[PDB]
């Protein structure tokens, strides 16, 4: 992703990918933790997960 949003690294993408694939849903604290670990905001995780769904639906 080199449009608008910052290009996520492999490590970042892999973690978010595995977490979402493993646990389609997360808790507030867990999301905050994941975000904290990624040195980002909860929004980064919240939107990434949703972006994946929207990508599946729209850009099927």
């Amino acid at each position: 992703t080199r449009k608008k949003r910052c290009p996520y690294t492999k490590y970042q993408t892999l973690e978010l990918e595995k977490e979402f694939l493993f646990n389609m849903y997360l808790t507030r604290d867990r999301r905050y933790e994941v975000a904290r670990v990624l040195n980002l905001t909860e929004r980064q995780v919240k939107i990434w997960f949703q972006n994946r769904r929207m990508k599946m639906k729209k850009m099927n």
Partner: peptide, 20 residues
């Protein structure tokens, strides 16, 4: 070295605009 960017610059939600 700046705090401009945007609250949605780091987290954009329009990467998937192609509905089709």
């Amino acid at each position: 070295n700046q705090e401009f960017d945007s609250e949605e610059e780091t987290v954009e939600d329009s990467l998937v605009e192609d509905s089709e």
